[PDB]
Design a protein around this ligand. Structure first.
Ligand code: HEM
Ligand SMILES: CC1=C2CC[C@H](C)[C@]23CC[C@@H](C3)C1(C)C
Ligand SMILES: CC1=C2CC[C@H](C)[C@]23CC[C@@H](C3)C1(C)C
Length: 417
């Protein structure tokens, strides 16, 4: 048993500084300091795990509750700020309720709405007019998510707006003015929306009905908790996908050939996605280099041992899938965009947990199936009808926030055939 090694920072704010000047680099640097190192952001210490294996151990071990200190500092506030009181403490139990709505079985029924949201974009974006990625990706997001996870009365541009005016408050404890007119409205709306399905919610397999079949304000809190993160994430995701279709014409058109073969001409549909291999490979390779979620935290319940190191109980640990997915030691062409490094042969070349956009423990992403489905749909629909090109002056330099998104990605759909 050996306690972790330290890294290197300043007085009152140890690593709290290097991290400040550039988080993403600090996560990657930390990789060589030891399999698990200790770092100090000011007075308190956290532990970082920089090895795929230990990070998988880390997720697959039920001994790590997720108060995760530089997450629950906001989650204690998310107890008013967002989600509401908590988020998956223990028991879970009253939380398997969610699985039935996100399983591989309940996604093909969302398929139509998914197809519909995609092709719609397709007529929405027209060649020549640059697409505003931040405002627009954030939209198909809401729409898809809300529209499949709830059905009937449309929250259309109303839900979007609020979350928008919302998401922007985070970048640059809670806030000042219009973030207000958006919040109450976000809650005003979610409630109003629970009230309505109460009418005739028969077959609705979505999350709302299953959530109406398991607390009074506990439902108004679990939707606002599932809909919130999952949207900004499927969004940031979309964003990097746009940069992808615009940055590697090759695969973009390659993605258009794959779609035509299988689809023939008919607009892409859930059945097809399950066929479009290259379409998903693109989506994955992109998510590896530019994930939306780049750090993940936990809070040990019991004094642990990891990679032979002693993890003090009650401790607070942190890891970076960002870094992991971009670790040389884990990948050959470390920074090379290559949708084909996911080819069966090279695929096994890559460590077990060196690529898991979502995680493995019960703190996993219920929409793994749900996401890739709408993303693959959305990737295929766009690449097929267009070809994306990035407006000069476009700013695709990363902005490190809740998730990793492009400060100002500007692209123009061009007409393909
Ligand atoms: C852009 C694709 C997505 C990625 C990469 C992703 C990733 C993740 C990760 C890494 C976690 C939690 C890991 C942890 O703390 O242990 C998570 C949790 C979660 N995600 Fe996603 N997600 C995506 C899309 C979505 C969507 C579309 C929804 C639903 C609208 C969603 C809903 C959730 C929920 C409710 C949780 C909390 C799980 C828990 O309490 O353990 N996610 N996601
Ligand atoms: C201030 C901040 C954080 C608090 C800890 C949490 C992991 C993070 C680490 C860097 C990200 C997320 C930002 C900049 C949003
Ligand atoms: C994956 C993820 C989340 C799951 C829900 C939780 C509130 C969040 C919402 C966005 C933040 C925290 C990140 C991106 C780390």
């Amino acid at each position: 048993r050996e306690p972790p090694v330290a890294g290197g920072g300043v007085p009152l704010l140890g690593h709290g500084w290097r991290l400040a000047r550039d988080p993403l680099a600090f996560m990657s640097q930390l990789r060589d300091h030891g399999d698990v190192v200790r770092i100090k952001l000011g007075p308190k210490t956290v532990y970082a795990v920089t090895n795929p294996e230990l990070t998988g151990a880390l997720a697959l071990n039920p001994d790590y509750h997720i108060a995760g200190p530089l997450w629950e500092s906001l989650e204690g506030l998310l107890g008013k700020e967002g989600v509401a009181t908590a988020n998956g403490p223990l028991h879970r139990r009253q939380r398997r309720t969610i699985q039935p709505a996100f399983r591989l079985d309940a996604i093909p029924a969302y398929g139509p709405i998914m197809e519909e949201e995609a092709h719609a974009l397709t007529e929405r974006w027209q060649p020549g007019k640059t697409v505003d990625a931040t405002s627009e990706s954030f939209r198909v997001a809401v729409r898809v998510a809300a529209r499949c996870l709830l059905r009937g009365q449309y929250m259309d541009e109303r839900a979007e707006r609020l979350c928008v005016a919302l998401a922007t408050v985070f970048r640059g404890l809670p806030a000042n003015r219009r973030f207000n007119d958006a919040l109450a409205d976000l809650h005003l709306l979610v409630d109003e929306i629970i009230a309505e399905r109460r009418a005739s919610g028969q077959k609705p397999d979505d999350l709302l009905t299953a959530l109406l079949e398991a607390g009074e304000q506990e439902i108004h809190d679990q939707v606002v908790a599932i809909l919130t993160p999952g949207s900004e994430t499927i969004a940031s995701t979309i964003m990097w996908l746009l940069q992808a279709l615009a940055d590697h014409p090759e695969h973009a058109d390659r993605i258009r050939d794959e779609v035509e073969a299988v689809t023939g001409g008919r607009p892409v549909a859930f059945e097809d996605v399950r066929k479009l291999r290259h379409t998903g490979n693109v989506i994955v390779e992109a998510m590896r280099l530019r994930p939306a979620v780049w750090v993940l935290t936990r809070r040990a319940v019991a004094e642990s041992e990891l990679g032979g190191y002693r993890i003090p109980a009650g401790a607070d640990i942190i890891y970076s899938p960002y870094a992991i997915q971009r670790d040389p030691k884990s990948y050959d062409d470390n920074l090379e965009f290559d949708p084909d490094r996911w080819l069966p042969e090279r695929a096994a070349n890559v460590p077990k947990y060196a690529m898991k956009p979502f995680s493995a423990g019960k703190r996993k992403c219920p929409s793994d199936h749900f996401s890739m489905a709408q993303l693959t749909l959305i990737t295929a629909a766009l690449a097929t009808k267009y070809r994306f090109e990035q407006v000069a002056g476009s700013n695709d330099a990363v902005r490190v926030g809740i998730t990793l998104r492009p400060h100002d990605l500007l692209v123009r759909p061009v007409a393909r055939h």
